[PDB]
């Protein structure tokens, strides 16, 4: 049996298909998947409840072995009818927007705090939501702007109900990590399917 | 000064359109939205942390006033390659498929257990997932079968990545409840927001 805990982006937009490919080639092999945020994954790995954990924020703990797994780009997005789309986008223009952010303790919020909102002086924090679907649908209804992994809003980017905003910053690329406890099981068979 | 705590189905697929229309005609008034599961909302209203709660499961707590608000139709669904799609679907066939269900404390978990899972004897619980999106894509890739609100899987029901399964049972309709504390009856500004939540 394998126990995997993934953060929101991974557990909802990367992991389901991997399990499909895994349980296709290995039926009768158990897999219990749990999805929370990056903090919940880290604490669940520390408690010896899961075998491996997949996080989208950093993790600098002595008892945790973190290895880079995939790359992921966060994007500022807005509704197509947003005034931010017309004209040159600057830092001061982005700080003046109503930002809908993920709760503190999520990897998305921590990374965007480091790469983006760190340079938006006194950015207006309009709403804090505990999941990215509520953030996605709020932004597409013109309730503000946000920053999420491209995997979360991919379908809405192609459909058109959400438009990527050109940010005057280097691309907001982040690393998704695989973690496990140092002091801690057919994982090699499962880790095969997490390769590109 | 209005704070609303809603469950995952309501917060993700209903409230955004309402709040947008509300902030359009009333841009001044503040509006704080929080989304969790049904137990999150119930516990928050009991603790006076939020003015009103919107849930997708029953709530029978003593000092919580629950009133039906909307109706919501749950759907048994699977991938286009499931054996549940053809023949007469029976309860023994349904119980024999891998069921991906929500975590306990979700209104969806409690309602499908009462209206459906109670009638599938010895159903296999393949997985338990904390959110309906992971469920939606797990079944979309073929991991099994589940039951979610039609609002959650409407996009996929359209394109065909997910297919509705006919259940030999009455249509699985649930009631979305609006709750508040028996001690704190809702204010007048809160009432104006409720007009926008109605059909
Ligand atoms: O769920 S993640 O954004 O930590
Ligand atoms: O998240 S809901 O099912 O309470």
């Amino acid at each position: 049996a394998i126990r995997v805990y993934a953060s929101s982006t991974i557990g909802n937009y990367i992991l389901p298909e991997i399990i499909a490919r895994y349980r296709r080639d290995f039926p009768d092999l158990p897999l219990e998947m749990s999805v929370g945020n990056s903090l919940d994954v880290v604490q669940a790995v520390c408690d010896f409840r899961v075998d491996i954990g997949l996080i989208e924020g950093p993790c600098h703990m002595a008892e945790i072995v973190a290895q880079p797994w995939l790359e992921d780009e966060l994007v500022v997005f807005a509704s197509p009818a947003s005034p931010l789309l017309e004209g040159e986008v600057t830092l001061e223009r982005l700080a003046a927007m109503p930002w809908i952010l993920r709760e503190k303790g999520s990897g998305t919020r921590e990374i965007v705090d480091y790469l983006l909102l760190s340079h938006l002086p006194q950015f207006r924090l309009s709403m804090e939501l505990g999941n990215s679907e509520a953030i996605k649908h709020a932004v597409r209804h013109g309730l503000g702007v946000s920053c999420l992994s491209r995997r979360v809003i991919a379908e809405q980017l192609e459909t058109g109900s959400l438009v990527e905003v050109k940010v005057p910053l280097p691309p907001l690329v982040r690393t998704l990590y695989r973690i496990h406890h140092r002091q801690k099981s057919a994982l090699a068979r499962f880790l095969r399917y997490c390769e590109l």
Side-chain angles (χ1 to χ4, degrees), chain A:
Chain A
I2 317 274
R3 299 202 135 141
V4 161
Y5 216 133
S7 44
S8 125
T9 304
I10 301 166
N12 296 354
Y13 296 102
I14 310 185
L15 212 37
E17 185 179 6
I18 287 180
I19 298 139
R21 296 196 331 239
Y22 167 76
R23 284 170 156 306
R24 198 146 143 65
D25 291 325
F26 298 109
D28 315 304
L29 260 299
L31 201 179
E32 212 215 334
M33 153 187 47
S34 312
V35 184
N37 77 339
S38 284
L39 194 45
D40 297 326
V41 177
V42 160
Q43 264 135 0
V45 173
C46 295
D47 293 4
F48 281 39
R49 283 187 271 120
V50 305
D51 282 320
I52 68 192
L54 308 167
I55 55 183
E56 50 198 278
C59 167
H60 295 278
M61 285 187 116
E63 64 272 65
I64 301 292
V65 163
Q67 318 168 219
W69 176 39
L70 296 158
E71 299 223 330
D72 180 74
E73 172 184 25
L74 312 163
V75 285
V76 187
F77 60 104
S79 51
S82 157
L84 201 62
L85 296 190
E86 228 61 77
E88 187 191 36
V89 180
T90 88
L91 258 44
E92 259 287 304
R93 264 188 94 201
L94 298 155
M97 294 309 296
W99 282 91
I100 302 161
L101 260 52
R102 272 292 294 277
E103 80 292 341
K104 302 222 47 143
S106 85
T108 300
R109 165 66 167 271
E110 177 180 10
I111 295 305
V112 73
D113 265 5
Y114 179 55
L115 299 180
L116 172 66
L117 315 153
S118 271
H119 312 99
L120 309 181
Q122 309 76 65
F123 73 94
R124 304 201 291 122
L125 196 147
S126 175
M127 303 204 286
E128 263 174 297
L129 294 168
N131 85 91
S132 312
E133 315 305 317
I135 289 183
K136 145 204 300 172
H137 294 307
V139 173
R140 96 168 146 89
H141 281 114
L143 293 171
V145 304
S146 193
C147 179
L148 298 172
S149 160
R150 199 187 286 280
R151 299 161 191 284
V152 191
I153 65 180
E155 175 136 14
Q156 293 79 24
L157 283 176
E158 322 265 38
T159 278
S161 34
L162 282 172
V163 177
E164 176 177 344
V165 173
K166 218 54 208 193
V167 55
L169 265 307
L172 317 163
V173 179
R174 80 185 161 169
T175 294
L176 314 191
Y177 291 107
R178 191 248 291 173
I179 53 166
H180 69 260
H181 202 281
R182 230 171 274 269
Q183 279 90 234
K184 172 162 222 30
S185 187
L187 266 308
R189 223 137 46 203
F190 177 67
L191 302 174
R192 179 113 157 75
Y193 299 86
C194 311
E195 318 164 343
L196 289 167

